[PDB]
Ligand binder design. Structure first.
Ligand SMILES: N[C@@H](CCC(=O)N[C@@H](CS)C(=O)NCC(=O)O)C(=O)O
Length: 240
């Protein structure tokens, strides 16, 4: 069979995480189900640093990637997007005792920690290009999401933008009960997608076909409830 290597950096829970030395989480199990009993393909998951996920797709080292990945035009120019597999809205996190940040309009002169090449880093970089008189303070980090949330709770900086499921998960698991969650709007549907290397066109056709099948047989809903506690799926009409 043809071996398909799926890369991930291992964050964030419950989309991706490790248990007993092995990768699991919603996206990992959705991909396992896509290839289960495939007469053509065998799947293998590999954990690598974040920058390595994209660099590996670029070099054709990896066939696919799952990593709580959002859509952007820039990514679409370099990689293929499979059908979406989850819907998860954006949020702004601040300390509950801080009344100075109530929306995304209040981040000027305030500090955060962001990861290179993420959609939130790109949004904030663009915010700074527009608001040159009072930019937000970005400190880039290679730490993963949980660590960043802990630092926010520790008072190391003022706010953090991320998504609902990832934020709620860390607030519950890490007991970060001093953090307040503010809903944020979205221009586009906040969907999460597997990405494939450019040229993996035949693979994309198979993956897309399987994602639709797993939606129809109830597997996506089953896995969503298992990992997230409720159904967080794209509308059926957008699953393509
Ligand atoms: N949905 C966003 C974030 C993806 C994501 O969850 N990245 C992982 C690995 S770098 C993470 O833990 N991010 C933490 C963060 O962006 O603070 C994107 O597509 O860029």
């Amino acid at each position: 069979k043809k071996e398909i290597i799926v890369a991930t950096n291992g964050s964030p829970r419950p989309f991706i995480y490790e248990e007993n030395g092995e990768l699991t989480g919603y996206e990992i199990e959705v991909v396992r189900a896509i290839f289960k009993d495939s007469d053509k393909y065998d799947v293998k998951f590999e954990k690598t640093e974040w920058s390595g996920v994209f660099a590996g797709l670029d070099a054709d080292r990896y066939n696919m990637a799952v990593n709580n990945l959002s859509y952007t035009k820039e990514r679409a120019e370099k990689y293929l997007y499979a059908a979406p597999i989850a819907q998860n809205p954006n949020v702004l996190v601040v300390k509950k005792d801080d009344s100075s940040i109530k929306s995304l309009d209040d981040i000027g002169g305030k500090s955060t920690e962001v990861v290179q090449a993420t959609t939130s880093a790109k949004q904030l970089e663009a915010y700074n290009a527009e608001h040159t008189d009072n930019p937000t303070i970005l400190n880039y980090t290679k730490a993963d999401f949980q660590q960043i949330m802990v630092r926010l709770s520790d008072g190391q900086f003022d706010y953090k933008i991320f998504d609902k499921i990832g934020v709620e998960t860390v607030i519950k698991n890490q007991g970060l009960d001093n953090l307040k969650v503010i809903e944020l709007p979205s221009d586009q549907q906040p969907y999460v997608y597997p990405l494939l290397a450019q040229g993996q066109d035949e693979l994309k056709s198979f993956v897309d076909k399987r994602i639709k099948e797993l939606y129809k047989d109830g597997t996506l809903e089953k896995l969503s409830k298992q990992f997230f506690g409720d159904t967080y799926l794209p509308a059926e009409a957008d699953i393509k």
